[PDB]
Amino acid sequence: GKSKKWKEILKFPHISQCEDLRRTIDRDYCSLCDKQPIGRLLFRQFCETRPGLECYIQFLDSVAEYEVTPDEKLGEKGKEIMTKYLTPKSPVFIAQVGQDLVSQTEEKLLQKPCKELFSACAQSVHEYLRGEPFHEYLDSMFFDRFLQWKWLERQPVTKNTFRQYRVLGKGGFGEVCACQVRATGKMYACKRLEKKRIKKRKGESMALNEKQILEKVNSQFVVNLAYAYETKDALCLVLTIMNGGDLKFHIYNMGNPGFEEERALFYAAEILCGLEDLHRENTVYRNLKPENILLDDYGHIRISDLGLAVKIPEGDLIRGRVGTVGYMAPEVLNNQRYGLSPDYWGLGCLIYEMIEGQSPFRGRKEKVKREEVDRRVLETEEVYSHKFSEEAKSICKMLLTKDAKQRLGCQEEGAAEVKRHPFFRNMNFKRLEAGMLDPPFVPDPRAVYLDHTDDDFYSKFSTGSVSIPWQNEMIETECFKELNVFGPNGTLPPDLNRNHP
Numbered sequence: 402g403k404s405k406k407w408k409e410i411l412k413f414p415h416i417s418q419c420e421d422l423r424r425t426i427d428r429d430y431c432s433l434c435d436k437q438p439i440g441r442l443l444f445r446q447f448c449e450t451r452p453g454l455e456c457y458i459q460f461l462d463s464v465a466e467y468e469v470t471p472d473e474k475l476g477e478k479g480k481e482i483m484t485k486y487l488t489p490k491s492p493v494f495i496a497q498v499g500q501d502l503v504s505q506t507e508e509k510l511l512q513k514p515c516k517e518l519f520s521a522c523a524q525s526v527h528e529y530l531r532g533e534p535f536h537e538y539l540d541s542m543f544f545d546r547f548l549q550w551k552w553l554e555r556q557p558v559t560k561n562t563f564r565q566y567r568v569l570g571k572g573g574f575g576e577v578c579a580c581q582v583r584a585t586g587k588m589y590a591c592k593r594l595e596k597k598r599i600k601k602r603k604g605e606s607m608a609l610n611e612k613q614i615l616e617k618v619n620s621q622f623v624v625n626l627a628y629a630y631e632t633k634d635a636l637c638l639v640l641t642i643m644n645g646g647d648l649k650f651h652i653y654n655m656g657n658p659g660f661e662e663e664r665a666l667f668y669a670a671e672i673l674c675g676l677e678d679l680h681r682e683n684t685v686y687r688n689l690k691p692e693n694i695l696l697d698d699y700g701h702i703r704i705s706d707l708g709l710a711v712k713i714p715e716g717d718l719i720r721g722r723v724g725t726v727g728y729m730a731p732e733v734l735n736n737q738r739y740g741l742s743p744d745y746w747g748l749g750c751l752i753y754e755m756i757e758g759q760s761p762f763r764g765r766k767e768k769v770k771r772e773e774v775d776r777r778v779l780e781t782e783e784v785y786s787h788k789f790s791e792e793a794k795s796i797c798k799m800l801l802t803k804d805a806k807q808r809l810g811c812q813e814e815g816a817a818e819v820k821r822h823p824f825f826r827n828m829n830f831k832r833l834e835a836g837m838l839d840p841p842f843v844p845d846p847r848a849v850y851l852d853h854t855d856d857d858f859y860s861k862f863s864t865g866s867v868s869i870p871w872q873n874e875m876i877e878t879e880c881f882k883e884l885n886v887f888g889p890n891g892t893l894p895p896d897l898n899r900n901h902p
């Protein structure tokens with residue numbers, strides 16, 4: 402249910418308005434043709450027109466399908482791809498991937514197929530597309546149309562862009578409301594941080610830090626920032642809405658308490674992928690506890706809080722005794738200089754708590770003080786039960802290694818070391834990252850569970866819409882499908898004609 406005159410809100414500007422856009426957008430191929438969703442579509446659409454590039458786009462699609470095919474069925478899929486795109490006389494043949502590469506890939510299919518069979522090919526393809534095809538697209542009407550979309554993307558966002566609903570919960574500096582973009586109809590979570598509260602507590606710096614971390618990360622398993630704006634009396638962050646409850650509720654209210662190992666495996670794998678996306682930005686989370694792992698309508702999880710998150714300067718360590726009792730790694734409790742390691746300690750706490758139905762250092766039915774809990778976290782070796790396979794015991798006691806330098810994933814290799822652990826032996830991360838694994842629980846939709854002194858902080862925070870989420874919103878709500886209309890028979894529409902504004 403969109404607005405009424407939304408076709409007028411998202412009405413394309415005449416291409417003559419986008420000259421300043423044209424002269425400043427960096428013409429990076431990976432950004433304009435892959436990273437940015439609308440750019441990727443417009444470039445692909447440009448290729449659909451030329452017969453010469455059609456086959457190249459189709460091949461990449463098939464290779465994306467191959468990377469995710471189940472193990473037993475790679476040879477069946479690999480052969481198909483080779484007889485359709487790598488045979489010299491096929492109707493859709495990829496020629497810029499020299500025969501010297503088609504012979505090589507035929508060898509790999511003469512042997513056991515790997516999931517990276519066409520990686521060499523696909524790169525040969527992209528290297529060709531970043532050249533002449535990309536620079537033709539840059540002078541095509543589809544790039545002009547991309548500029549029109551960027552012009553819309555950069556429009557100011559205000560309280561009237563959104564339609565507030567209900568207060569979902571509360572936190573430290575404010576509350577979280579449910580909002581809806583009027584023009585598109587997409588739902589979001591409005592994290593309203595109230596102004597007065599940020600000034601009294603002199604915590605502007607860590608609010609900007611949360612907004613910058615949220616906007617820089619684009620993970621399927623962490624809440625994404627779509628907008629950041631200032632209203633009459635607050636500064637709101639527009640975030641992924643999550644209606645499927647949180648992991649604490651499902652461990653204790655819906656659980657035994659606890660989950661079957663396999664169910665916990667799924668959630669752990671997704672949480673691990675969330676942490677890896679954060680760690681790519683050398684950003685440490687430090688707040689991993691079940692109430693911060695939220696579920697969406699489909700059953701997938703995302704890491705939700707980020708107020709205790711900080712971007713570690715590359716090559717440097719941080720210091721900060723923060724977090725929640727019982728979910729602080731020992732190096733944090735000791736107020737030492739650490740890196741990303743607290744997050745893998747947290748991952749250990751989550752996997753343990755999902756399987757056993759209680760924290761590894763605090764019995765569910767135990768009246769204990771903060772001191773004894775912290776003592777346990779620092780000296781006591783946790784125990785396991787028959788709810789854990791040998792593989793589950795291993796990963797947990799490896800992630801719960803007291804010494805932060807002997808702890809799984811805290812090596813130069815990072816998250817990859819954890820994904821290789823036998824506990825994920827039956828987990829195919831390429832299919833999980835692709836969203837092809839059915840979550841173990843699907844929540845029912847209907848279910849319910851003062852001067853210019855500050856102005857400089859306001860401006861750096863209210864940056865407006867975020868590029869990738871915004872374009873994704875346009876695609877999901879089908880605003881793109883509906884507005885991205887050109888002229889009849891590949892002709893040029895008025896909004897892209899410089900001869901009649």
Ligand SMILES: Cc1[nH]c(/C=C2\C(=O)N=C3CC=C(C(=O)N[C@H](C)c4ccccc4)C=C32)c(C)c1C(=O)NC1(C)CCNCC1
Binds near residue numbers: 570640
């Ligand atoms: C729909 C929904 N969203 C959320 C919540 C979120 C969300 O969605 N995105 C996000 C992103 C980030 C946060 C986050 O950092 N906050 C921290 C604590 C915070 C800090 C400072 C100020 C305010 C808040 C929370 C959320 C909650 C609970 C329900 C909820 O409980 N909904 C029912 C009560 C009704 C029907 N569905 C399930 C139960």
